[PDB]
Amino acid sequence: PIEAYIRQLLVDPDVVPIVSEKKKELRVRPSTRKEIFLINGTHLAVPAEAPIEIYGLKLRLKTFSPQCFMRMAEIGSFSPETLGYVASGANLTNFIRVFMKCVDQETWKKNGEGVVVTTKENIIQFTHQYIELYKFLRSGGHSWLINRLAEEMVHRKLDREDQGSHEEIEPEENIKRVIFFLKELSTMYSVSPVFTSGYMPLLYDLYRAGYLEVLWNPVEQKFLQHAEQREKEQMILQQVDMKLTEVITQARQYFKIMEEKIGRVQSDAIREILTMEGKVDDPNSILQEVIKACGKQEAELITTEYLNIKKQWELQEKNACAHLKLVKQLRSGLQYAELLKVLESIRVLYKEKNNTTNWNLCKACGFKLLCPHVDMLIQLQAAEASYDTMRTKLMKFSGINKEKENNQGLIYSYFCKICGEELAHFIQEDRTADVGI
Amino acid sequence: MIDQKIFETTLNIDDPTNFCTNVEAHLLKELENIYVGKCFKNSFILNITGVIQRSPCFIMRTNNSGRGYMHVRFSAVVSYLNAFDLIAAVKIIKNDSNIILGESLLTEPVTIVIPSSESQNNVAEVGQIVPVQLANSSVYYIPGRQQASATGSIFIPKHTFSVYHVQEELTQEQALNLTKLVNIIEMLLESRSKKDFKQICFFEKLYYTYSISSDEILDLKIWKGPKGKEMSRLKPCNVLSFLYDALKNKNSSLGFWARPPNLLKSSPLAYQQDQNSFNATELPIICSAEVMFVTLLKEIINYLQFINDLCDTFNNEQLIKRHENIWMLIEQRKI
Amino acid sequence: MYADLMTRTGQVTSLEKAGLNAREPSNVLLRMALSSPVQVLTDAAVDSAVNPIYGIAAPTLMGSVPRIGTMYSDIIMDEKYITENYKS
Amino acid sequence: GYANRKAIFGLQSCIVDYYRRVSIDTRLVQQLYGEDGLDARQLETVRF
Amino acid sequence: IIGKVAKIKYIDRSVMYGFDEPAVVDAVMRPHGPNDEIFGLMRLRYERNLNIGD
Amino acid sequence: IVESPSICEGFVQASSQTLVIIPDNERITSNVLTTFEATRLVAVRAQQLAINGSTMLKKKYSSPIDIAKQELFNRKIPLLVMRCIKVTPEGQKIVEIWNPREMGIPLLD
Amino acid sequence: EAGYAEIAAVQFNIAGDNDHKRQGVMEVTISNLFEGTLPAEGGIYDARMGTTDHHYKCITCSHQRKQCMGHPGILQMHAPVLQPLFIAEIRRWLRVICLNCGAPIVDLKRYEHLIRPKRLIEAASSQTEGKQCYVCKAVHPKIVKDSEDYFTFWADQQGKIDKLYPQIIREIFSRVTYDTVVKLGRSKNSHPEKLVLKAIQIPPISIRPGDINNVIQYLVRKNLLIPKDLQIVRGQKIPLNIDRNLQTIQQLYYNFLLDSVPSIMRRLPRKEGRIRKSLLGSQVWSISRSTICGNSDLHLDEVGYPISFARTLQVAETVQHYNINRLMPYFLNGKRQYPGCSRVYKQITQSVHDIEGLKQDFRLEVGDILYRDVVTGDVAFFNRQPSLERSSIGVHRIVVLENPKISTFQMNVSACAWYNADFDGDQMNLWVPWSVMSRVEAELLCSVR
Amino acid sequence: RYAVASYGPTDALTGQPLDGKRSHGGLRLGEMEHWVLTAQGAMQTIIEKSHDDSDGCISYICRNCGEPAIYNASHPIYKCMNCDVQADIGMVDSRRSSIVFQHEMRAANVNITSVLSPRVFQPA
Ligand SMILES: [Zn+2]
Ligand SMILES: [Zn+2]
Ligand SMILES: [Zn+2]
Ligand SMILES: [Zn+2]
């Protein structure tokens, strides 16, 4: 614990450089490069380690601006030591200038302000004052004070910019009748009248409506009738399209249930006869299945079972069970250690351990709860599973096999056979571990 | 401590239409969901007091999601833990052959890393709770954590002290600033006064630097505690009323100030002299009255909070007598 | 547009690397894309060049999109209109 | 292609601002686009 | 069209027919290369008429 | 003597800005939406409708694009156009706030 | 928790030892590549610097291959190495400062009136050989560039020749004060000390998937040969093996960065470079190309588009209460009829579902995204290269050709004037927008009208 | 003729599709096509094609120091290895080719600090 190493760790900051003379008794070496002064006043530097004699020391009183402290407080994530350092520099506080002023006398002079000490024991006093200065800057004190004053000054600034700081009348008769026309047309066309002084949005509305003749020709009534007519055909076509599409939807539902009940062969044959009839997607496939290939009752049950599935889907829409929200918190990622316990809280609602081939069902309500591959995927995600170790393990849940050679669309991803969810994707093997050691 | 702070952030609004229906309510709810209970910007946020300024709900420009964002400048009550601070409730969680981890049960969620190389903390029991003294190191505030990382050790009262040479006194503003500190002192002191004296004096006597076998009920009409040793003919001076009169400007604060081990630390009294009669092994620290006043008041705050937390946690005789091997180690190191 | 760009500095600049360096010395990313990224990058580092993000090449080289056309004017949510008119 | 690419990389920074000026991020290239502020697609040939 | 697996249990380095228009396998043979080793040679034939865009 | 770098210099985070809204009577920009601004408004509204779907349009359409277009045309779109005029060195950001419910729509339908 | 932000400015600086030490996430200590099927920790392939496989995750960000951008490493060189890009800059700093005291030799005030970019260049351009230093009394030798390589420097003091090793160069540059740097024009961030590296930065794995790895491995292996406690002082004789080892290390680093400018900087310049092929250009999905054809029955704003291509490209429709009835017939057709759909995105599972593996649902849930087939009336971007005018990319209304034997993009002959196209064998691109934002702007802005 | 998919084979380095029909990759929207789309003002189309359909990703940049950060919503990581205590991470919409481009310049001893757009607040 000699003085030399204390002076050595004094060297670390950009403050307190060294004046060096070849004829003295002090001898310390720096830890890094240091920019130093000399007698005769030459500004030089020294490398990381080099024997340098100490004539004396100078702590510079760097003068910052309050704007720098305000900028750091705007950042608001600085250690109290740095904030206090700058505040003392920016004349906002009076700590460094107090712990210093151990000057023996003004025995040396340069540009910047600072405390100068060139002796044998007052340098020890300087070192003690510097160490105690940063001890105060690091301690519990000066941390309440600087943080509080920074918060107060930021709040006062917000008050400065917050608390201390912050026409048409009547149109013309021509535009009066034009705005009357627009008011009457508003309930008839996608136009809303405004009252701007420049008349310009009105001009764009009239131009867009394809009828600017109101301005000079008093023939607005024929355009009003034209707009009423056009709205009428628009509504008629819209309703016709809605009826057509609901008919198409019901017919496709009927044919899908036919496919799921009586098989692909009979369903595709009935599609063939309907295709060479121009009546596909029309519920006369009911009559076709009645008088063809089976009895009327086997189609009556199809209709009733369609209505049953519709009722079941409506009931599922009406569902407000607890499990549903839980599933959402299982599908948000969000801190694996929490989704693991979410899965724990969900798995208590299973019924028959539902290993494979079908959905898990909720005992509380009765509808589907969670596909098993989702459970396995959550377990692997919480179990530090790599993508390859996750893609291969979720292969017993692989979707439809070579049963379908292809659907004319090239796919690079596997899907779950239980629900259809995408398990993973495979394009090419990585083959980068082939170069080993 | 527990103090106010101001933060700036940017929030992502998934559905701007629903969000804009009640902007203030949604903003407070989202800020509480995101930032409450986590470490961010060298602090641990406890509560979101409010939003001072905010930006219009912009629409994100660099993607086709139609999602929104908002710049929020909000004021929040947070906790910053300093060095050499007292925590009187630290439950030991991990005591292995490598390292010791304890958890605090106070309003400053902090994990304590106690080095298992000192005879005080080498032998303990998992599940035991113990007061902990923080080392002279900054408390780590890793962003996104639920706790503050800081090293510490079991608090053994020390035998040393410091002497402050004050040569410049206060002004009016520099005393109105310390008015907040004396307000904290009086609040903690009322908290002390609203509680029974038996465990107060037990803890204060047990954490006295020397051995207090005699019983005394020393009173100041504002602070109550057991009396200990004196220093010859020197009579303490109450720093609270001292600072009050200094604000009234009918007293001079210049001279030597000291807080010796024999002195009643949690009391608002300390020693002042015109010349050092103290047999201190450390050189006097040349300074003004700001630094000495703030340090002494912070020390009084720390010790008052320490005693209050000790009495809050240990309610009956079972709690105090369960950990009596820590307390035995405490008596084993007093003069 | 050609003449006004080439003569905006008081001298007839060119549509080559030398001309771009005169009109837009601080737009390194645009200058990197044009002719020789290595030469421009080396000079930018030693000069401590600060490159504001504008135009097309600078936002494009950084992975963003230029603030042009539909992106020129940003859109903010009408807070006052929604509160009285819409519901949560 | 050699001339087209060099022309674009010099000219692309010119963008019409809210004053119908042509500028480079702060710096005016034209006080008014085309000295008339009009679009090339919206011009009519008219005799005086 | 060509099955090929590398023994590590096995990894599948198969060859798949990635063309929209269907082909017909015209000739399959297993010659020996310059290194005296088997490689697979397959000839796929396409029945091409004149269609729009030719 | 120009000395070693300090903490006052070397900041990377730019200082925050204060949004200065030009008063309505002191605005210079046009009272007519450009095709770019109208297209951006319609696209943003259509995407938000695809997200939320809550609209006050009295008519019924089966596409977010059509609903957004009719909302813009019927002056019922819950959006504003902020035209950034200038960013001042002292920190202010002078902008212009325009309401598309009282500007001329350049689109056609 | 991470808010939305945009890049406003970019600052360019020289990366020193401290920058590499901070930004690096690990220190390379071994030359081994893989410990079995996992990368060896401490090697150049370590997973802390990122991942490029599906067999492991990145240790740093805990992301998969797609979401990990890579993180840099640190390799502590046994001997200092010069920065390949800024070698010339080093030469400048060797011609202005004294090699024994560091003080400037030329008068700084003689270059005050110049602009700071050119101060150092026009100060080092003048001859400085033989000038006598004002503070240490030393004669400045001439700094001659070795003609056989791009980095070696020799000092000639009137016939006395010395080789300036990078450690000597560091010891010379570290003695230079920031006042000299500032008054010579260069910023504080461009101090010459940063021009000599002892801890080089290992680029992240995302930059070198899978030759560059070979160069890095060679550099590490040959760096391990150099003694860790090697010290170099000016005027000291060096064993020839160590000299050639240092030569090999520096040449390997230079070829790693500037090999005849495989190197990092070779990826940038030309047309197939990083900037012009990956940044200014792009490879995209959901796009089609075919030979164009004449069709006089199509409108000028319509394009004939084959049904086979219509069933490949998809349009993303978000399910809501207004389009539940219209989108439903698309759902029920699947991939077995036209028009149908191929893929559904669910908000409930936040995942992607097939249409052939999912047939147990009566209808769709509100909020789902349906990827339906392209139908007649959809808008599409239609492009011919080269794109010289801004009408070269236009939006046409799609007319789907039900004939399975048609494979061409048919358009009206009067629409060729937009693209400068003809039917002698030209091919034109076509991509159908699927995003709502891009689909709106195609109809309003990019329409060929 | 060619028409590929919404997804397929991907370049290892840039994260972009492969080249041409032969590799079952995508087709090129080259330099001249971004000029035309910018001239037309089609910016949301550029986002859809050059980002959503090619290599668009999310880049995390620290505000306090401008260096790339590390964020992960699951397995919470919120850190920055240049400041490490005062990190203020903000997400920016970027593309993988740009991140690769920036890393290559940092590999050449060139420091790349990104100055994020400053926060803007109302004066109320
Ligand atoms: Zn349930
Ligand atoms: Zn990573
Ligand atoms: Zn010299
Ligand atoms: Zn940072």
Side-chain angles (χ1 to χ4, degrees), chain E residues 7-41:
Chain E
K7 182 175 73 175
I8 289 171
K9 173 69 177 68
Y10 281 101
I11 192 66
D12 173 69
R13 280 76 178 272
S14 288
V15 176
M16 186 172 113
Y17 180 75
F19 285 113
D20 291 331
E21 64 182 0
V24 177
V25 187
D26 199 7
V28 166
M29 64 184 73
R30 293 179 179 90
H32 300 272
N35 297 115
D36 194 321
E37 60 183 1
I38 288 284
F39 66 93
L41 187 56

Side-chain angles (χ1 to χ4, degrees), chain G residues 117 260 337:
Chain G
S260 179
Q337 295 294 321

Side-chain angles (χ1 to χ4, degrees), chain A residues 319 321-324 349 362-367 369:
Chain A
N319 205 349
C321 171
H323 82 282
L324 290 163
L349 294 176
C362 194
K363 65 177 73 175
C365 183
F367 296 101
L369 173 56

Side-chain angles (χ1 to χ4, degrees), chain C residues 18-31:
Chain C
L20 192 62
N21 199 2
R23 291 184 300 266
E24 294 178 354
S26 62
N27 200 358
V28 181
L29 288 170
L30 169 59
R31 224 164 72 235

